[PDB]
Enzyme design. Structure first.
Site, PDB file in Angstrom:
ATOM      1  N   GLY A 156       0.773  -1.226   0.000  1.00  0.00           N
ATOM      2  CA  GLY A 156       0.000   0.000   0.000  1.00  0.00           C
ATOM      3  C   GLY A 156       0.809   1.283   0.000  1.00  0.00           C
ATOM      4  N   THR A 157       0.104   2.368  -0.324  1.00  0.00           N
ATOM      5  CA  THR A 157       0.565   3.745  -0.197  1.00  0.00           C
ATOM      6  C   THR A 157       1.219   3.993   1.157  1.00  0.00           C
ATOM      7  OG1 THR A 157      -0.714   5.061  -1.770  1.00  0.00           O
ATOM      8  CG2 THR A 157      -0.579   5.908   0.496  1.00  0.00           C
ATOM      9  N   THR A 158       2.172   4.900   1.228  1.00  0.00           N
ATOM     10  CA  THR A 158       2.825   5.087   2.513  1.00  0.00           C
ATOM     11  C   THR A 158       2.152   6.179   3.365  1.00  0.00           C
ATOM     12  OG1 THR A 158       4.903   6.139   3.349  1.00  0.00           O
ATOM     13  CG2 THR A 158       4.808   5.622   0.973  1.00  0.00           C
TER      14      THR A 158
END
Lengths: 237, 198, 243, 102, 242, 235, 233, 241, 250
Positions: free
Chosen positions: A23-25
């Site tokens: 996932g996105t950070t």
């Protein structure tokens, strides 16, 4: 899921972690009277309405939540977090202390690793706020494991982000300020986008500071947002 | 209040049941049959509350008929009457009890005896040479105590009833419009369909 | 896959793999704990390891205050530990409401043991990967240590140890009691009992400790409490001037 | 004891012509001997060229008008936007009322 | 083999696809929609000469203005018909009017969704999809004469003509050429009879094919044998002279 | 509870299979009574035989059963059979007809065949009973919920051997005493022990009760088996 | 690897994927194409309907949800019926209880939360449909894209279904033109109709081929079919 | 709640559990029904795995549902009891609420419905039973015969057969049964019924049984000897070259 | 949440075995040896208290449990299973008997109920059988003294003497050689004490041996005087000290 592998681990939980790492950070940074949260939003297309796909979420009035992994799973968890805050307030009158709010999410997440008819959550959630005795920051893994943190990171850029955080902790034993952490979060998000840079991104920050917001959860918009987008752009060019 | 009489002679059981159905200020029917055949050798007569009465009787009838076809065999009068009793006794404590009194007359073929059972809406059961429900018993019990003999023919039983009816046509406030009479013996159930102008 | 590997049904040798695997889980945090009894206290020591510099160390604990009088230390992963802790708190408060006295240490052990037995027997629930050591100064029994595991087993102890290096600590303790010939640490102050407990932890693990490497819980008559870093430090200072 | 009912007083009148109809009401709302309002309408356009008034206990009246306006809405959803004829409305309203028979 | 409502890698539901195959094994049913009415015809297909052919009920009334023909596992159609009849009668109870054909169909299709092993719908009381497709024909004031095909997916489709069952591929192409927006009812009847003759695996007579239609003015009528025989003695003659 | 391609019931077939390994029980129906006899499976000297029962069970006063299969599955079914007999008595003021109690137990069995994904009961029953519609009756039910009536029958181990011998020596006009005799003979030859001793047996009769015009149930004592084994020349 | 890990939704693959969800997403790719776009005063849905036969109806693909909201579908149509129904009720509940028209965004969150449950429950399947949601509410015109994974995103324009990519390309480049089509329904519809064309190998889109819906400042959500859309071909 | 679906579709569009149920029917002993001018006859075969039975008490194969309608079956015996119970209850219930006994068709539709329902419910298996149902509608003389099968399909048959080697007997009936000229009386209808059973049974000893249903609840079984009198009269009479 | 295994985990194999029950029996085989012997005026049940480390406190574990004042149980197999079976058994002695008839159940009937609980674990969905075998020793006015074994299947049977677990084969034999129907209680104790010496490895004393009797009524164990119509419980656990004394004259 209700299944231990022969090493004593839970393979379903383990794979859930893979979904998170994918996932996105997103990060959180504790400061001397508050907590700051920031996230990376991938601009998939020019067509996304800017500023209009909000990812950070409020629980009650004093708690922020941000997460990486399967976004729906994060939302599900916040909904339960909200019922869990209400039911505490209704009964005990005081708003829910962050440690207490952390165990409530803890126990719920952990329950989804007990039964073979449920799957674990595919998110790590970074959340926190200000209560009757200070600022508190937490991160919660798909296993239900959580601890208090000085700084926290999860998603694709977690290693680089964690390394930045480690630097701040070491270089500021006295504590950081809310205004400072806001900019630092913008920096750190820019500096984890390196590990995800084939798409353009939009930066979203929120905070909860005793002196800066009265201890209520707020989004950082307008001047203060631009200022941190500047500070981050500066220290990478 | 409906007249429900039962007399048990030597080779048979006779049931007599009033023909009137009255609601309020009107007699709506003067030819009602207050009786259901439960099996070829068991007949049931009933009185009580307006709707309950037939619903209970037809329900008992379905159940006995089912048992008949399932075992290809006819339950004894005693067995039928225990079933009915327990049904009433369960009902008495439910949310809306059945308000129904019954007479059960049957010929037990395995024993060759006629049998008469009286059961009230509470589930109170008793086997008797003669019986009645309601007011009519206040007249007929003493009459039969006097004129009844255990070894009477069916013909004598019919004369015993004629008296019982006559007395009730003399002393009861309400016009019950005569009775329908039925005999239950070794052959079965027939209607003596000519009792009123007899 | 073989179903007797995935759910808690028997294997041909009369075995329960998931329970065996649950025992394996208990060592995942790589922490040893030990418990001992004084004359009128009970001590629990457990290693504390804070690898990540980002963690707030004050939140990292495997010791739990179950009630006024009962502490619990868990060997196993934290989520399972917390679940067991929430339940024992609830059970101890319910017992008090229903029966009008404080739930004794062993009765809570037995109750948690029975809950574990159920996961051992029912298919839809996995066992919990934890060992729970319960301590108190019981109003009837005295200093008490009772320990439960994922099989549903529990027993009382003179002293005990749990974790990777359990065997070394155990035999070390057995050796002490063989020599002293009493079943408790013959010391009036709990401070000395803590000091004993740390000392033998040091000797059996071949390691020195700073104040941030330990966690201590003490049970006395009508209180269980945990020590702060500085109380622990003062315990570490006293052992230094002797040993 | 709690009485779940009141009377908000209020009178309504409907007349049908050859190719029109009227539904009229006064606009006064009352409790016992007091006036609550001098202008609180109680005759409503319900869509589909139907007007409706439910007069008596105003709380019950409002509930019924709401439930019927919603009926009309779902009738459009469930029946490809068909116009709800007055006879079909009437019957529907019978069912709304009778569902509360007890 | 894992679950009842599972997706294939191509994004189709296994059980829904297999039910569709059970339908292909079924007898043929053909419907044709005109402006004088809609016609429905079926292949009886007795599994033996000893079957009393008119005990084969594959065209059923739903309401005076709505009829239905089935194909596939026809035993599964009972609870669909029962539900369609209740919906139509109930609508008339609540609204003092006839249910619209589309609405009736949509209700039958709602019924069809209700499969799943205690599935997180709410509540799925049914373990498998239906093994039967339905042609639903009727008339209503708003949208005139109408024909619908309702699959056990819960999807339904409106058609000018349609065929379902074992002969459907062959029948569909024939309908494609033969259908036009000016067909009289009588022509439509001949065409159904004709296309059934082509695809029936016997020689079409009045005992092994059955016809029916709905007119606005006379409702849904199943044609009795003598009336069918006459049309059959008549198609043969239109198709001798040419 | 699933079908096989052939049209058999997996769990049922395997349950019958299980029963084939259980101690043998025999029922023989006479003119004036019924015999039930059963063999205990590989026993021991220390096993109590006084207070012991495991194959012969009283259902009411006019009906007994012989068990072949899992003892504990059988207890379950005996308990509900007993209750069912009593409900009938309470409802009707008449002892339950043998057929009716049998059909009911068979219906329970059949249930586990058709729904709920629970294992069938690993049990077969021989029923000995008297009622006044049919007199003496002998019935058999197995895990498939099938029941049938018999002049003589066997269940459990060695039913093939057992059935051959009964067919050979049984006759309609038999008295109960010859049937007792025949029961032991048949068990003598089918046993997997050396010889048939008293401690390996359970025995019951349903007789017209010497003098009374009434039906009696006798569940033989250890000594009584030992005695009846002498008369028939087996000591 | 892709082996015992697509049995149900209650199961993660070792990569961290949910395959049943991926396969549900797939039924969308197979669905007929639909376009959404919006200016500042209106929002439009264009949905190419797909027939089964030359004799059949092109199946309806636009559903009205309230006076101010509606949606178009691609994928399992029964699934669009369940979710639009839920949306109808939610819009309704907002009206009865609070006298409030439901915000498009809330509708999005609601749909997302409903789809999510089915990605975590045993014995249930993910929804197999994508939805484009248009609305006019208190903060103006809105368009949303719904994925059966339970991801909803807010966009100026988009397309879903068969060869949606062409239309989506076209819209990315036409952005600055269509966004300014304010107070002019017809130029917005046209920009939508033409945008759906960049996705037709098929064909000349016809009178029964075309479905259009609009919602706006003084425009209740309305669907146009047949005769009414002819003037757009 | 165990509602784990047992009856599902196979890739080729078949429900195997329903299919395997039909197997059990063919595994079941034979049963046949033939309807005459003013009668319907039902015949069954008994099996021979054992020959020490008591027949007074063992359940016959023709069951009365009501006084005017009977039911015979091929397949699992245990399965059939359950259908018979449910059929009998429905027959009483219909009397109670419609004040008329069931039509034969209605009772068939009912039983068929029960069987269909068991093909689509979680955690139940279909009935290993196919049935023949025979009788006369109240106040009606026109004779009635229907068949149902595990799928829940039903229809009426001039004559029909089910169970093991029914293939053979359906062959016979197709040759012999004339639509034009139903068998006009009881005796000759029993004749055609016994003949068709003779192909599969061997000896008409303790295996062939017969039941005759006439209008107005007239239903009588036959005796061993009355059977034997048809057996004797057909084997000798029909062997001439 | 919720149970998803609504089917039996114990099914029949093609050979007609019930696997899970056999495997439960294998688990019982591994278990520490336990035994019972029936005297004429008593019954004795006994087992070994296999400690895990001398840091454990053996007395705090209950291998021999009072079920009613006149009925005891011991077991071989999985300890945790025994413990829950004892709790359920004590409770059922009440809910099924004492709350109904105002007296404790007779031994056979209590055994019957335990047996029932065990059988139910053999057939219910989502559960495995109990991995124990029990020996239940009791007394009751109408049947006197009795001894029963209950197995994972729910089968029970009465014995004059028997043994279960590890050294069972050998111990059954040792008992057969030593059992006559005329044994006093003190003799059956002595015999039990001998039989157990074969089983054990380590120390053999009153601290590694758990032993209980069902004998005479113990008035001094009643807790109260003044209703002469009970002299007390017949169940008694022998003390550590009482076992050692019998060991010197062993």
């Amino acid at each position: 899921n209700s299944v231990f592998s022969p090493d004593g681990r839970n393979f379903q939980v383990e794979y859930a972690v893979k979904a998170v790492e994918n996932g996105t950070t997103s990060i959180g940074i504790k400061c001397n009277d508050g907590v700051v949260f920031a996230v990376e939003k991938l601009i998939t297309s020019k067509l996304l309405v800017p500023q209009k796909n909000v990812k950070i979420q409020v629980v009650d009035r004093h708690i922020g939540c941000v997460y990486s992994g399967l976004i729906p799973d994060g939302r599900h968890l916040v909904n339960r977090g909200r019922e869990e805050a209400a039911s505490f307030k209704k009964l005990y009158k005081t708003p829910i202390p962050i440690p207490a709010f952390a165990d409530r999410l803890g126990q719920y997440v952990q329950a989804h690793t007990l039964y073979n008819s449920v799957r674990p959550f595919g998110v790590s959630t970074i959340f926190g706020g200000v209560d009757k005795n200070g600022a508190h920051l937490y991160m919660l893994e798909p296993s239900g494991s959580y601890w208090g943190y000085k700084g926290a990171a999860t998603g694709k850029g977690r290693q680089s982000a964690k390394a930045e955080l480690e630097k701040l902790v070491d270089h500021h034993p006295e504590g950081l300020s809310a205004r400072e952490a806001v900019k630092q979060a913008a920096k750190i998000i820019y500096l984890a986008h390196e590990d995800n840079k084939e798409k353009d991104f939009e930066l979203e920050i929120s905070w909860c500071s005793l002196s800066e917001t009265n201890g209520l959860h707020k989004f950082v918009k307008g001047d203060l947002l631009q200022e941190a987008i500047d500070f981050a752009q500066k220290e990478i060019n | 209040m409906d007249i429900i009489l039962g007399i048990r002679v030597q080779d048979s059981v006779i049931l007599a049941s009033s023909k009137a159905v009255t609601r309020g200020i009107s007699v709506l029917k003067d030819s009602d049959d207050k009786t259901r055949q439960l099996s070829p050798h068991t007949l049931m007569s009933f009185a009580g509350e307006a709707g309950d009465t037939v619903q209970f009787a037809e329900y008992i009838q379905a159940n006995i008929q089912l048992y008949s076809i399932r075992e290809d065999y006819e339950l004894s009068p005693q067995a039928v009457s225990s079933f009915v009793r327990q049904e009433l006794a369960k009902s008495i404590r439910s949310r809306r009890p059945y308000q129904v009194n019954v007479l059960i007359g049957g010929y037990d073929k395995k024993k060759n005896k006629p049998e008469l059972y009286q059961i009230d809406y509470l589930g109170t059961k008793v086997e008797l040479p003669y019986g009645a429900h309601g007011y009519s018993g206040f007249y007929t019990f003493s009459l039969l105590d006097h004129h009844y003999r255990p070894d009477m023919t069916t013909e004598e039983g019919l004369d015993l009833l004629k008296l019982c009816v006559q007395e009730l046509e003399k002393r009861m406030p309400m016009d019950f419009k005569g009775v329908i009479v039925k005999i239950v013996d070794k052959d079965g159930i027939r209607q003596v369909d000519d009792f009123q102008a007899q | 896959a073989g179903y007797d590997r995935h759910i808690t049904i028997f294997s041909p040798e009369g075995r329960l793999y998931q329970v065996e695997y649950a025992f394996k889980a208990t060592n995942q945090t790589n922490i040893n704990s030990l418990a001992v009894r004084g004359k009128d206290c009970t001590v629990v020591i457990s290693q504390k390891k804070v690898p990540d510099k980002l963690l707030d160390p004050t939140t990292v604990s495997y010791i739990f205050c179950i009630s006024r009088t009962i502490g619990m230390v868990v060997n196993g992963p934290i989520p399972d530990a917390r679940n067991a802790a929430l339940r024992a708190k609830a059970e101890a408060a319910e017992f008090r409401y229903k029966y009008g006295y404080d739930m004794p240490c062993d009765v809570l052990a037995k109750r948690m043991a029975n809950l574990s037995q159920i996961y051992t027997q029912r298919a839809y629930m996995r066992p919990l990967g934890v060992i729970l050591t319960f301590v108190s100064v019981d109003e009837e029994l005295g200093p008490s240590i009772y320990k439960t595991d994922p099989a549903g087993y529990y027993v009382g102890y003179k002293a005990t140890a749990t974790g990777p290096k359990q065997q070394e600590i155990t035999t070390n303790l057995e050796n002490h009691f063989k020599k002293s010939k009493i079943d408790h640490i013959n010391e009036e102050s709990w401070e000395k009992v803590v000091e004993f407990a740390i000392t033998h932890m040091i000797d059996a693990l071949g390691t020195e400790f700073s104040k941030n490497d330990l966690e201590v819980g003490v049970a006395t008559k009508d209180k269980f409490f945990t020590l702060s870093a500085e109380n622990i430090e003062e315990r570490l200072v006293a052992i230094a001037e002797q040993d | 004891q709690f009485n779940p009912y009141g009377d908000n007083g209020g009178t309504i009148l409907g007349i049908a012509g050859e190719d029109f109809a009227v539904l009229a009401g006064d606009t006064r709302n009352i409790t016992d001997y007091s006036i609550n309002s001098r202008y609180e309408p109680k005759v409503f356009d319900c869509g589909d060229n139907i007007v409706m008034s439910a007069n008596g206990f105003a709380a019950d009246g409002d509930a019924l008008v709401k439930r019927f306006k919603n009926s009309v809405k779902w009738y459009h959803f469930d029946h490809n936007d068909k116009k709800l004829s007055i006879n079909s409305a009437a019957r529907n309203i019978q069912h709304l009322l009778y569902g509360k028979r007890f | 083999d894992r679950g009842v409502s599972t997706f294939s890698p191509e994004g189709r539901l296994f059980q829904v696809e297999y039910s569709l195959e059970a339908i292909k094994l079924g007898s043929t049913a053909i419907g044709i929609a005109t402006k004088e009415g809609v016609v429905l015809g079926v292949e009886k297909r007795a599994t033996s000469p000893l079957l009393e052919s008119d005990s084969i009920e594959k065209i059923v009334e739903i309401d005076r203005h709505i009829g239905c023909a089935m194909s596939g596992l026809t035993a599964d159609a009972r609870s669909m018909i029962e539900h369609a009849r209740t919906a139509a009668v109930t609508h008339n109870l609540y609204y003092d009017e006839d249910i619209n054909v589309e609405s009736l169909t949509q209700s039958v299709c709602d019924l069809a969704l209700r499969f799943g092993e205690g599935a997180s719908g709410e509540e799925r009381l049914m373990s498998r999809p239906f093994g039967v497709a339905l042609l639903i024909a009727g008339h209503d004031a708003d949208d005139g004469y109408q024909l619908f095909h309702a699959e056990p997916s819960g999807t339904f489709y409106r058609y000018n003509a349609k065929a379902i069952g074992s002969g459907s591929e062959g029948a569909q192409a024939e309908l494609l050429n033969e259908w036009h927006s000016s067909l009289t009812l009588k022509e439509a009847e001949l065409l159904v009879l004709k296309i059934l003759k082509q695809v029936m695996e016997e020689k079409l007579d009045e005992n092994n094919a059955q016809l029916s239609c709905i007119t606005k003015q006379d409702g849904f009528k199943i044609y009795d044998n003598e009336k069918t025989a006459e049309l059959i003695k008549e198609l043969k003659e239109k198709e001798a002279a040419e | 509870t699933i079908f096989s391609p052939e049209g058999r019931l997996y769990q049922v077939e395997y349950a019958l299979e299980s029963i084939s390994h259980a101690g043998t029980a025999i029922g023989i129906m006479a003119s004036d009574g019924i015999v039930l006899a059963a063999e205990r499976k590989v026993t021991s000297t220390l096993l109590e035989q006084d207070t012991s029962t495991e194959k012969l069970y009283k259902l009411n006063d006019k009906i007994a059963v012989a068990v072949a299969g899992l003892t504990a599955d059988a207890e379950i079914l005996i308990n509900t059979a007993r209750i069912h007999a009593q409900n009938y008595l309470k409802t009707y003021n008449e002892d339950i007809p043998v057929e009716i109690l049998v059909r009911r137990l068979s219906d329970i069995k059949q249930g586990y065949t058709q729904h709920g994904g629970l294992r069938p009961f690993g049990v077969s029953f021989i029923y000995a009973g008297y009622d006044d519609r049919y007199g003496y009756q002998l019935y058999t039910s197995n895990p498939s919920g099938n029941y049938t009536g018999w002049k003589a029958i066997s269940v459990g181990a060695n039913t093939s051997a057992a059935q051959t011998l009964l067919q050979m020596d049984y006759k309609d006009d038999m008295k109960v005493d010859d049937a007792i005799e025949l029961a032991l003979k048949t068990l003598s030859k089918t046993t997997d022990s050396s010889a048939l001793t008293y401690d390996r047996l359970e025995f019951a009769t349903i007789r017209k009760g010497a003098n009374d015009g009434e039906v009696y149930q006798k569940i033989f004592k250890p000594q009584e088996i030992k005695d009846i084994l002498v008369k028939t020349g087996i000591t | 690897f892709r082996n015992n890990y697509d049995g149900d939704t209650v199961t993660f693959s070792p990569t961290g994927r949910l395959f049943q969800v991926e396969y549900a997403l797939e039924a969308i790719k197979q669905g007929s194409v639909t376009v959404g776009l919006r200016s500042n005063t209106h929002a439009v849905l264009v949905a190419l309907k797909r027939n089964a036969d030359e004799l059949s109806s092109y199946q309806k693909k636009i559903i009205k949800c309230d006076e101010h909201m509606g949606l178009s579908l691609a994928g399992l149509a029964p699934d669009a019926r369940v979710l639009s129904n839920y949306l109808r009720q939610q819009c309704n509940y907002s009206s009865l209880v609070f006298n409030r028209k439901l915000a498009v965004e809330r509708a999005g969150h609601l749909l997302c939360d409903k789809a999510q449950k089915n990605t975590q429950s045993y014995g249930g399947r993910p929804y197999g449909v994508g939805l484009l949601i248009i609305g006019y509410d208190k903060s103006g015109a809105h368009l949303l894209e719904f994925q059966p994974s339970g991801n909803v995103t807010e966009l100026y324009g988009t397309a879903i279904g068969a060869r949606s990519q062409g239309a989506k390309t076209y819209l990315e480049r036409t952005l600055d033109t269509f966004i300014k089509i304010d107070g002019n329904p017809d130029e917005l519809i046209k920009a939508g109709v033409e945008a759906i064309s960049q996705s037709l190998r098929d064909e000349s889109l016809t009178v029964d081929n075309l479905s259009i819906a609009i919602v706006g400042k003084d425009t209740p959500f309305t669907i146009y079919d047949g005769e009414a859309v002819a003037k757009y071909i | 709640g165990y509602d784990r679906a047992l009856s599902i579709f196979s890739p080729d569009g078949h429900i195997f559990q329903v299919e395997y149920a039909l197997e059990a029917v063919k595994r079941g002993t034979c049963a046949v029904g033939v309807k005459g001018k003013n009668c319907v006859v039902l015949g069954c075969e008994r099996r021979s795995t054992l020959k020490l039975q008591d027949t007074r008490i063992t359940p016959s194969k023709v069951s009365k549902i009501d006084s005017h309608v009977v039911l015979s079956f091929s397949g699992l015996n245990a399965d059939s009891r359950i259908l018979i119970e449910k059929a009998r209850v429905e027959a009483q219930s219909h009397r109670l609420t419609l004040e008329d006994p069931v039509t034969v068709e209605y009772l068939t539709r009912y039983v068929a419905g029960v069987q269909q329902r068991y093909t689509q419910s979680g955690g139940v298996r279909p009935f290993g039973v196919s049935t023949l149902i025979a009788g006369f509608d109240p106040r009606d003389d026109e004779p009635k015969l229907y068949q149902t099968e595990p799928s829940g399909i039903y229809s009426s048959w001039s004559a029909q057969t089910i169970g093991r080697n029914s293939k053979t007997v359906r062959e016979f009936l197709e040759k012999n049964y004339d639509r034009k000229e139903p068998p006009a009386t009881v005796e000759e209808c029993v004749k055609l019924t016994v003949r068709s059973l003779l192909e599969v049974v061997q000896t008409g000893a303790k295996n062939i049984e017969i039941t005759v249903v006439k209008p107005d609840s007239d239903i009588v079984a036959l005796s061993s000897e009355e059977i034997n009198q048809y057996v004797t009269q057909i084997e000798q009479e029909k062997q001439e070259q | 949440m919720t149970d998803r295994y609504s089917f039996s985990l114990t099914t029949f194999s093609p050979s007609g075995k019930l696997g899970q029950i056999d495997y439960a029996l294998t688990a019982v085989k591994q278990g520490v040896t336990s035994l019972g012997i029936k005297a004429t005026n008593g019954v004795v049940i006994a087992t070994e208290k296999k400690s895990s480390s001398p840091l454990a406190m053996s007395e705090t574990l209950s291998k021999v449990s009072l079920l009613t004042p006149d009925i005891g149980a011991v077991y071989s197999g999985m300890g945790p299973d025994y413990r829950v079976l004892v709790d359920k058994s004590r409770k059922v002695a009440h809910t099924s008997y004492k709350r109904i008839y105002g007296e404790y159940p007779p031994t056979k009937l209590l055994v019957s109920e335990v047996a029932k609980i065990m059988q139910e674990a053999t057939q219910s969905g989502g559960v495995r059988p109990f991995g124990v075998s029990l020996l239940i020793a009791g007394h009751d006015e109408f049947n006197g003294f009795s001894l029963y074994q209950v197995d994972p299947s729910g089968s029970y049977f009465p014995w004059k003497a028997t043994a279960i677990g590890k050294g069972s084969v050998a111990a059954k034999t040792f008992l057969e050689k030593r059992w006559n129907d005329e044994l006093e209680l003190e003799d059956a104790i002595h015999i039990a004490l001998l039989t157990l010496k074969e089983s054990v490895e380590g120390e053999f004393n009153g601290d590694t041996i758990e032993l209980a009797i069902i004998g005479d009524e113990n008035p001094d164990l009643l807790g109260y005087t003044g209703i002469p119509t009970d002299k007390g419980p017949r169940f008694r656990k022998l003390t550590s000290q009482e076992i050692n004394d019998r060991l010197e004259a062993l």
